[PDB]
């Protein structure tokens, strides 16, 4: 765990158990010109390539690979089900480039075999602004693994970014790597219960029998909060200052511009609900005031472990904000937490409703932010996965990830991880 890292042993990363006293860049300053203007050396038969999301075929290949090779053989029937919609949303954040959506195609077969994505973001690390990139969607074909190509991809994506004068990045990973800045856990709230035990994504306790299952997970068919409308372009100016105001409590965050805020929460118009990705909602008051906002996105799995099904609806809790405790000076005040807690339970309660209504079968959260105030209550069941947050070329003191030493939620201090990854 601590020394089994050939590649990361050479990278600008915080090392295991490092007592960071002064936060900041790791490497000594460099400039884009003292950076190779030519891609790294690939296996003799392989070749590099960019991915134009606007290109039907090019993007078509990407999700095929990710749908076939994203699961790592612990079959329960699942295969991710990335859609063109999903990636059109995820890969076209303001500032994106085809260069940055890198892949590897075999010189002759032209079949894409590897992929890794980078999109520009400004990060807030304990008040310091850090021009960065966000890395995600790293994937290699199953008959090309354990052959150490990933580090090549990581070196090639870094080069291309460095060549644009961007020297840092935030990436998340399950596996433990040199320097997590924080760790959070995945909790899952069932919506189409029966359908889950059916597909094996949920266990069934003998002494709480199937009947009681569905009976407990039950949920209204319509929301319950006054003014619960839905996000519209007109709301932006206002919801952005509310979101900004609320996110200031965290130590790690993405400093959205109104453009990336807009792009992020208002997706493509005219998309069947059978193909929508982002769901942003907002609470307005007679006053005309927006005081709440929350969002979740959709990423389903294809199926094979069930005869009646072939799909599984999954929703993830994204960003949200409220003005409950804006009256209090200290976030952790006993009463300040009073407000904030009930509201989030309300909002998230409706978010679960909108989710099943949108056809999701299970809602996923991550102990990050204050999802800990409502996770257990609204009954989100803690799962196998854990996520680690990393900062490339940046030294920062550990950030509370919403976990207690025994992996139990920490209703106490909650979390300071303000970002949420796709």
């Amino acid at each position: 765990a601590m020394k089994d890292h050939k590649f990361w042993r050479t990278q600008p990363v915080k090392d295991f158990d490092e007592k960071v006293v002064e936060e900041g860049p790791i490497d000594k300053p460099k400039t884009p010109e003292d950076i190779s203007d030519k891609p790294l050396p690939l296996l003799s038969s392989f070749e590099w390539c960019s991915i134009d999301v606007d290109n039907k075929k090019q993007l078509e290949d990407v999700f095929v690979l990710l749908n076939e090779n994203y699961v790592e053989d612990r079959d329960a029937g699942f295969r991710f089900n990335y859609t063109k919609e999903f990636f059109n949303w995820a890969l076209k954040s303001p500032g994106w480039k085809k260069d940055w959506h890198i892949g590897v195609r075999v010189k002759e077969t032209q079949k894409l075999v590897a992929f890794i994505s980078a999109i520009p973001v400004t990060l807030g690390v304990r008040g310091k602004q850090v021009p960065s990139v966000e890395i995600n969607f790293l994937c290699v074909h199953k008959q090309l693994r354990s052959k150490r190509l990933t580090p090549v991809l990581i070196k090639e994506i870094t080069r291309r970014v460095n060549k644009c004068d961007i020297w840092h990045a935030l990436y998340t990973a399950g596996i433990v790597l040199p320097a997590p800045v924080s760790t959070c856990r995945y909790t899952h709230r069932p919506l189409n219960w029966k359908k889950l035990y059916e597909v094996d994504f949920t266990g069934l306790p003998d002494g709480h029998t199937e009947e009681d299952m569905i009976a407990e997970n039950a949920l209204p068919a319509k929301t319950k909060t006054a003014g619960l409308r839905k996000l519209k372009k007109e709301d932006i100016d206002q919801v952005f200052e509310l979101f900004k105001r609320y996110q200031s409590r965290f130590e790690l965050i993405q400093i959205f511009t109104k453009e990336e805020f807009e792009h992020n929460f208002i997706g493509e118009e005219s998309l069947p609900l059978d193909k929508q990705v982002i769901f942003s909602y907002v609470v307005e008051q007679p006053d005309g005031k927006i005081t709440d906002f929350f969002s979740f996105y959709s990423l389903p799995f294809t199926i094979l472990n069930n005869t009646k099904y072939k799909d599984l609806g999954i929703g993830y809790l994204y960003y949200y904000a409220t003005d409950a405790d804006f009256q209090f000076k200290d976030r952790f005040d006993p009463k300040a937490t009073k407000a904030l807690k009930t509201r989030l339970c309300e909002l998230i309660y409706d978010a679960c409703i909108l989710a099943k209504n949108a056809n999701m079968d299970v809602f996923n959260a991550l102990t990050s932010q204050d999802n800990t105030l409502f996770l257990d209550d609204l009954k989100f069941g803690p799962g196998d996965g854990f996520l680690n947050f990393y900062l490339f070329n940046y030294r920062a003191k550990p950030i509370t990830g919403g976990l207690n030493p025994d992996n139990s939620n920490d209703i106490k201090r909650r979390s300071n991880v303000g970002v949420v990854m796709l």
Binding site: G174, N364, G385
Partner: peptide
Amino acid sequence: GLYASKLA
């Protein structure tokens, strides 16, 4: 990250 996770 990855996602769906599991539990028993």
